[PDB]
Structure formats: C-alpha cells, structure tokens
Amino acid sequence: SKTNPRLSSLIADLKSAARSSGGAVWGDVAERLEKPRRTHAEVNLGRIERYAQEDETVVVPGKVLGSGVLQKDVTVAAVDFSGTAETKIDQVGEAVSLEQAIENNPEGSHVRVIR
Amino acid sequence: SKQPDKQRKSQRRAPLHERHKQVRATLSADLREEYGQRNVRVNAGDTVEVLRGDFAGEEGEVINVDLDKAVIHVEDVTLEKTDGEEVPRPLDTSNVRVTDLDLEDEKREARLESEDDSA
Amino acid sequence: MQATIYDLDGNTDGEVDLPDVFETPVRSDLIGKAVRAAQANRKQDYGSDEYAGLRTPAESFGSGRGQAHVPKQDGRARRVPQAVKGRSAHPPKTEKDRSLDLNDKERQLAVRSALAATADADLVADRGHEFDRDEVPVVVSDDFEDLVKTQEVVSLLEALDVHADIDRADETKIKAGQGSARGRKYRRPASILFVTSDEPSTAARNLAGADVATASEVNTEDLAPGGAPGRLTVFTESALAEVAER
Amino acid sequence: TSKKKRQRGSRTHGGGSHKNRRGAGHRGGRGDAGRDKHEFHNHEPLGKSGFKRPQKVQEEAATIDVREIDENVTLLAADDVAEFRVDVRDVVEEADDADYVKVLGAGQVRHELTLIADDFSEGAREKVEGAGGSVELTDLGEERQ
RNA sequence: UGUAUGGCAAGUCUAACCGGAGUAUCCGGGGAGGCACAGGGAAACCGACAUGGCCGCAGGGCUUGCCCGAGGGCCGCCGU
RNA sequence: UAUGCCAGCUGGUGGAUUGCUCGGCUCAGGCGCUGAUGAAGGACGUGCCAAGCUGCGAUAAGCUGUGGGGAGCCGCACGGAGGCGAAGAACCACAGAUUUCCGAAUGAGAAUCUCUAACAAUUGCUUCGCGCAAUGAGGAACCCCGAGAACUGAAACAUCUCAGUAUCGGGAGGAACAGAAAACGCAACGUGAUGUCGUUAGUAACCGCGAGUGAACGCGAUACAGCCCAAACCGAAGCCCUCACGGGCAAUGUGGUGUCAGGGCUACCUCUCAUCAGCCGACCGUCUUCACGAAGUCUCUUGGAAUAGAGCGUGAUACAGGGUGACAACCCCGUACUGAAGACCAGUACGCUGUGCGGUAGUGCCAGAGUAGCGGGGGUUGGAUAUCCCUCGCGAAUAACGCAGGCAUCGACUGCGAAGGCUAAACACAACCUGAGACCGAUAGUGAACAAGUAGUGUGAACGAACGCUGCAAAGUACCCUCAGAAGGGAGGCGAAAUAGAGCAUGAAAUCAGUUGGCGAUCGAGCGACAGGGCAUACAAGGUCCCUUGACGAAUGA
C-alpha cells in the first residue's frame, strides 16, 4: 500500500498512458512500482554508461544514484534521482522525471529499460 | 495548577483569611465608579440585590456571612419550614450585587478608597 | 512567485518574491508523520506500581478442600491476575519507550512541505479555515511586530477579510469522556498562525485558536496542526524571507 | 488489522495444542541448550581455532582502489593538476587513525596519475604506470625491504 | 533475523551533550562512534570483473519474422 | 382447573451500568539531615457537654511578639448552652513560651511505674572535680566498609550460572566514595587528578573452551583545582585553657623551612602576584510564596434554576484551570503583564590583606619497610603466565636508587617515584515542597478516596478487609388519625422531582411477590433451528398480505 501520494499519482498516470496511447513500457514500469520498494531499481551511472545509447531514452523503474561516470549524451528518466546523480547526468545529457517522459512520449517509443 | 482536582481542592481547603475572597460580590455601577473596583468582600452591613436564584430581582440587607461554607444570609430571602417557621436560604455571593456598603469600620473604608489596595 | 505585502491598515504596500520552499510539493503523509512524532515525544511515561497486588504472603492450599488452587490469605484470594485485588498481568510499564525517532532530512522535508501547503488557497480552505481572500499566506509589513493591543490585530484581520477564521475558532467544545476529570474538559478549532521574526506576537497570541511562532523555529505542528496541511497563516515580511532557508 | 489483533477467541493464539506453550521444555532448554545433542543442527562445531595477537601490535591500513581515485579526478580539482598528481593520504577518509594508507588496484585508470601513498599493490602499480602514470612511495612508506 | 511503507544514497544515522525557544514538545548544533564502501588467511601477509563470450524474459526497434536485449541464466577471467 | 411451565407488567431484592472525583499511580523540577539543649517513636492526659480523628502538653484544639489579614470567630463536625472579637479576634508567615511519662534513655530498678542526688557506660582534655567536652539513637531510599545463600540456568549435575544477588553485621552525609600518577602505552616530537554520561563493545579476556561471563586505554561530553605533611637545614622562636592571674602541653620536638615546576645547604641573578592562611562578600539564575490585575451578569423564549437558544455589547501582553441552581474570557477565585519576599546557588565568584614565584652553580645532606619483591594455601576478577585481595613463610635497594610499559631474566628505551595526608564542582536517592499526565476512575487505582495499617486474626514474629454520591436550597416532613409506640401505617406538608426521605443520583442480571398473555392434572426428556398452524397485540419506530382472472413462463412435463 503505497503511502506516498505522488508515487500513487505517477502510477495512475503511467497506467493511463499505457492504456490510452500506444505505450506498453509505462504500464510495465507501473507494475514494477506497484511492487515492494525492495524490488525497485537502484541504478548507478556506471550502469547507464555501459548499456544506454544516444537518442534512446533510458527508463529506470526506480531511482538513479551517482556512482561511476557517464559520458553519453542520453536522456535518463527515473522516478527520482540522487542529488549527485542528477548533477552528473545534466553535465553530459539530461535527467528527466518519469512524469515528464510520459507527457512528451505517451507512446513510450524508443526507450530502453534499465535496472 | 491547571488540574481541576487541585483547583477544587485549594478552594474547599482554603484557610479562613483566604476564604474572604470566596464571599466577594460585584459592585453596582455607582460603587464601581466611586471606589474604582469591580467587586468587594460582602459584609453583614451591606445591602444587596439578588441576580440569579428564585429570588432574582429582590433587594435586601446582608444578615450573615459564613466563611466556613462561603455563603451569605440576606434579609427576607427565606424558606418556609414545615412547622411554618421561616429560615434563610443561603446565597452564593457570585449571584449577587452590592448596592450599598457598611463603612462603620475605618479600616474597610480606607482599604476601599486606597489605590494600592482593594477590599 | 510573488506575495503582496500589506500595511497595518490592510492596504497593499508593495510586494516581494514568495520564496522557493513554497513551491515544495505537498506531502501530507510525511507531514502527518512529523506531527505524529512530535505529539508522541511530549507524552509522559506511566505505569502501575511494580508491587501492586504482590504485597501479601498468600498461598494456595493445593488439592484437598474442593477449591481451585488460587493463592489465599485469611480466606481471601490474592496476588494472581484473576483474583480481585490481584496484580495486573501485563500492565502499562514505565520502562517502555514512548518516543518516535525521525531522520532530520525526512522531518525538515515535512516542514518545507507544510510551509508550502500554506501558499495554496484551496488547501487552506479545505483544511477548514474561514476567510475571503485569493492570495495566501497573508504577508504583512514588519511593523506588525510592534503592535501591542489584541484589538489592534483584530481590526487588521478584519481589514484583510481573514477574521472570520477567528469567529470559527471562537467556540469551545466540551469533550466527551473522562479527560474532563484530568483537566482536558475543553478544546477548540485551530485558527490563524502568526509567524514573526524577533519574537512571537504577544498581541495576537490571545486570539481564539491563534498560535504565534517565529521563523527560526516554526515547526510542522503549527504549520499543519493535527497533521492536516494548509493552515491559514500570516507572515511578517522579514519572517517570510527568513523562513526561506529552513 | 494485525495477526495479534485477530487472536481473541482463538483460545490457542496459534500455538497448536494448549499443551504446547508452557515452559522451556517447548524450547528444548533455555538459550543455546542442547547445541551439541538434540539441537546440534546448524551450529558452528565445538572447539578452538587459531590464535590472536595483542591488539596494540596490530596494524590497520586504510585502503583505496584506483577505480575510486580515477573516477573522481576532475571532481578533485582541489588537488594538483600536473602534466594529475594526487597524494592519496588526503583522499582516503579516516587516514589518521590508520597505521598507513595503501592503494589497491581494482578497476581501471583512464588517466595518467602520479600517486603518493605509503603502499601500493603490484596491480596498483601496473595499472597506473600502464596508463602513463607514476607511483611515489612516501617517506614513511619507505619500509619495503 | 524477515517483511511493508518512508527519507537519503556511495553513503547513511547521530549518542552523550551545547545553544535557542513557544522551555519535557520544538528549532539549531554535535559524526564521537556504528553500519555500508574488498576480500582472503590461524597468522605473517597479500589484495579483486567501472564487463570478455553465449543464451534469453520483459521492454524497445524494423521494411513484421529479423535486430537491440537492462534484470536473469551459463561461462570465462580476477583477489586470497 | 389445582401443583406448574414460558414471556411480560407493577412493586421489591440486588448494586451492575452511566455520569461524577476529596484517592491513587507515574514522570519532572526544587530541597535535604535529626538527637544528651533528650530525638524519632510510643504512653497517658487535654474541650462546657467529647467516643473517634487532628491539635496541643498540667499555660494541654492552646500562651507571647512582630508582620500580614480582617468582621467575623470558637478544627474535622451543619447540636445546645455560652463565649470571644474595633483593647482589631479568626486566619497566615516568622520568631519565642510552655512542652507530663516511657523512649539512645544516661542515678537505680520497672510491661509507660517506682526507689534514694546521679552525663549510666566508654572515651579525650583536665583546675584530676563529671570541671570542660565527645559517643549512643532516628531517617524514604540513595552511599561506604564487612559477612554472604539457595531455588534457578546448564533442558541431569560437581566447576560454571543465579550473584557478590537475597539476607545479615558496622558506619557517614545531604549526598556519599573517589582524586592530583612509582598513571597511560591510539609507542608518541603523544595524553596529563577524580567521578559520571555517550561510545569504544558484547570487542579483548574468561569458560565441563559447554551453557554462559565480560572489561580497559582512547574518543565525544559534563564539571573542572589544586594542595598539605614526614625528613634534610633551623631548635622553644610554638600550642591549648583562662577576662587576668595562673595552669596544661612540648627536646620521645611545639614552631620555621619544605613537598618532583624535588627540596635543604653554600654562592650569587632576579623576583614575588604562585601558593597557603585570613577579611569582605554578591549579581544573575532556580524553586516557592505573595501584591496588583481588563471586560455584560443586558433583551426575548424555555426552565425549578440560564452558564442554553435567539438578539445586542465588551476585554484580551488575560480564549490556562476552578467555582457559581445547565455549556461562563467579560458573575466569583484566578489567568497575561509588572512587581515583592523567602530559600537554594553561597560564605561561593569577584575583590582585598598578608606571604613569597622563579633561575644558575656546587653539594652521593634529605625523600614514608615486614614495604617492593619471592614462595606455600585460598578467595575474587574479563584479567588470561598478564585482576584485586586475605592468610602462613621469606624478604631489598636508597635517587649514583627504585617501580611501570599484560610470561620470566638481562641490556636498551619511554613513563613515573610506592610503602604519609587533604581536596570544591559535574553523578545517586526521594523523605519533604511544587508542578505535570494519550495512566486508574470506587471489585479499578495504593492494602488504604470512608474508622486504614482502621475493624479484625495469631502467644509471637506477623497477618489484615469492606464501606464514595439526598436536594438548588434542609425547605431533613408541622398538624391530624391509628398504634403498646420518638416504631410502623394512613392522611398531609416541602421540592422540578420523595420511585430525590437518609448506605436517599441512575438502579442491569440472577431472583421474589402480585398480576397479564399462551399452555395445563392421558402424558416423554439438549429445552432448539427451519416450515406451517391456534390464541395474544394502543400509538411510535416496519407496511404489507389474501383471492378470481390475465401476462410471463427454467428444468420438468401430462
């Protein structure tokens, strides 16, 4: 039972997007967020640098932390970002909120899920 | 203390000299203007007007002032016993108003007029 | 954003930028947590006497007389929980920790969210406060801290169409239950919170339901009494600015 | 509603037979009783193993992997920018209560660093030098011999 | 020792205690110290994969079976 | 239909329930010793009438003074009689008077009395005389020094554990104890009296190496404070009693010096603001108590009563709490603000008086013995070879010496001088004062809201209850009838209410009397569930139900 009101909203919006528009990842991300927090993603930068690729939005079904280096000019979208994480990402690319992602890309196209 | 039990306790157990404040009644308009007080310890000489009981509206002379029970006897404010006798109906001074004072005591008159103290 | 400053007559007197903290997203769950903690933290330890019901050499006769093996003293049962005048089995205990911990960050985040809830007119009205106004919180010139008469603060709140909240709070409820016997007979709505900088408003403090506070220490409770976000507040210009770095 | 809250009316509160939840018998003894008889299962075996040296004769090195230093070169602008030069003793946290600072060689080194520490691993040297770097042993660190 | 929820995150939390104050609440300070950030070995002592290969779920892509495939799975390789 | 069954009704019985809280329980702050000048405790007295409680002590619910207070009063406890108070009583604060007997109990003896001047007993001083003094006993626990179990855990049990716990003996204080290194040993170019708090750490260490037991250094804090002798060198330069005279002590050493920044002595430099002794002596703060202290008791309706509803008005540096015939900022006490006193902080801080800090050179002058240390036997500890202590035995050096740094010996190194002494503050408890509460609310909470350690039980040690509520006001029921009648009853009176009439708010169940409905002296027993009939039913809070016929019409189906 998610107690955070905003996490609750995000999930309702992720769903609406997966249902209304063509998005099939949003509903997928929604399902992971509905699961226990321990199962949520805690991803460091070193892992985005290794697997992400330019012009393909990185979707993290959890939170991004600041360990390691990120050189790629990628748009990372996560539920939340650590202070250092967001600062490091914006230096080379762009850290975006999952709620922004949904508004801009409701069809959830050209997106790589990372955990 | 803010605790009800202690409050009621200090009132029901106050020593004689402290019980005077339990027999205080509000002064009339003129009396409030004249002595610069809102109330005063009702004396057995004072005249008073009942403002609350079944005797509300009545005027009378204070006949007795019991400190032990913190209650007073006013002239004509009575009850008829079964044998026909007429006995006083004790009144709480907070349900009464002083309309006239007994200033035969130089000490009370002095206290009433002084700005530093109050009677 | 911007906040219209008002002089002691209720007329506009310029305006300042409403600090960023008031943009902080409302987090009623975190707020309620901070409120729950602060309320628990002032609760006093209690518990029955360690030895109540144990002060007796009562013994059980055992089998033989057609009676249950219950400890008795002078033909009267004692000690055991099922016995009248017996010890309480699992009573309130003094040793118990009745305090709740809270991470400073988590609590500081709640203060900010509570602060922010103040800036939302719909929330404030939802919380229950009665007022006729669009902007909120109510910003006033620092010359408010110099007022003395309570009545003077009244005329000002009437000039701001915000006094109705005090008429909401001008009613004491005589509670149900025995708290009455413990000195908690009455209670009343929580109305306006006045936040200043140097010292709490001695002039406003006695207003029905009003709570006064200073910007350096205004907590989650006065900001969101009972854990409910959005209290109708009035900040003094300097306070408004000082509250920014909380 | 919790589990505890639902126990009223259950009589046994989940303990099975009312003959179960009595004294320590239901536990096979108090504490670790029977750790080598009826309850030997999942218990480190009985016995003594090894020895301990006196604590004041024990040294405690403060270690750090090159990966850590290297990933934070640009961030550590507060430290020498030679033809990058870094005195590890200034990087490692808790480097005073430690007997010395040793650099371990885990990870990569995408830069040319000049490291100063009391000790380095064979892999720490290889990696730093192999990236056009040099390794400097501190005066204290001059114990290797 | 689990779990659910919440904060922060290569970090995290302060303890005693200090200041303030609306004075047991509360605001500020306090990182001593704990746990995590490397392991192996009785000890001396030594000290590791910011990814090299193959499968492949979800998801994405395409010209609609073919690509990319985090997690996961099987190996390599590394420290002792 | 009798005996009777079930449910209800009126009235009891009972005292649950609801509401109420003069009592508890717990937390916090403050404060904190008493006694031979006879305590604490107990006994017996003491009132106009007085049994209990409280007070007091033959001056007996009190006497005196000063201040406060004030028109009343004569305790709990509302009677009767009577008295006291403006000669300022009551009442409160401070100080004083009195203060029986037993009691450490002290002239001697004794179940609270008695017999014929008494510090009994033990001590110090001493005019050697009880002449001057001390001790004794108490206190809620806290504190210090001694003696020291077992149940229990180990699933038995011996070591171990419970535990240095329970309990016992001795003793101090308002706090105790500890304390200015023969320390530490993050081994250092480092720390620097002692407690305590956090941590170090369930780490090191112990252990049928089982179960279990369990530190320290350091660190962060709190509070901070450092000194005095013995001896060397001086050698009566001294101390105590007394108003003085005079006496006592003291060469077996009073007194000066001095105390590891070693000191003494000799020779110089310089100087003291250290120390030690002593005078003065708080601010602030905290706890408690007290003075002062704003604004409605206006209209209408209801009511027995307005603090209620409706209307109108006010204060607020005061909307904490209590009282008052129902819900009160504005009726009364209080509350905010300001101010005053006492106590604690504290004979402290500061200030002051006096004294003299310190340095060089020389000098083997001085520096604590059954000690340091070793062995035998025990206890204790985490202390392991390496804790601490007891007991028996043995037993050293002299600063050019000695001890410590977790096995011994020797060398090096670093640290530090034992076998003499004192020492503020920060910490423990809760008797006592005050405050507080998501604690209990009369079978609860204390055993104890009440006569509570009461009644009562036991030879004794010891054990030990239960009992709270009339009403706004006693208006607590006059008169009359009846009766053996201050009984009870009837009638009557009071009050909103007597089914509020005295263990008197409310008044449940079990259960009782009378009574209503259903059943009932030919009939069978888990007392009922579900169906369907009889009989029974004021309103309200449920409004449906029956029959012809017609419509629809699952499985089934003439």
Ligand SMILES: [Cl-]
């Ligand atoms: Cl990661």
Ligand SMILES: [Cl-]
């Ligand atoms: Cl070891």
Ligand SMILES: [Cl-]
């Ligand atoms: Cl040290």
Ligand SMILES: [Mg+2]
């Ligand atoms: Mg006057």
Ligand SMILES: [Mg+2]
């Ligand atoms: Mg009990």
Ligand SMILES: [Mg+2]
């Ligand atoms: Mg209730």
Ligand SMILES: [Mg+2]
């Ligand atoms: Mg005698």
Ligand SMILES: [Mg+2]
């Ligand atoms: Mg056993």
Ligand SMILES: [Mg+2]
């Ligand atoms: Mg065994």
Ligand SMILES: [Mg+2]
């Ligand atoms: Mg032990």
Ligand SMILES: [Mg+2]
């Ligand atoms: Mg040590």
Ligand SMILES: [Mg+2]
């Ligand atoms: Mg001397």
Ligand SMILES: [Mg+2]
């Ligand atoms: Mg032992």
Ligand SMILES: [Mg+2]
């Ligand atoms: Mg009781």
Ligand SMILES: [Mg+2]
């Ligand atoms: Mg009754």
Ligand code: NA
């Ligand atoms: Na008892």
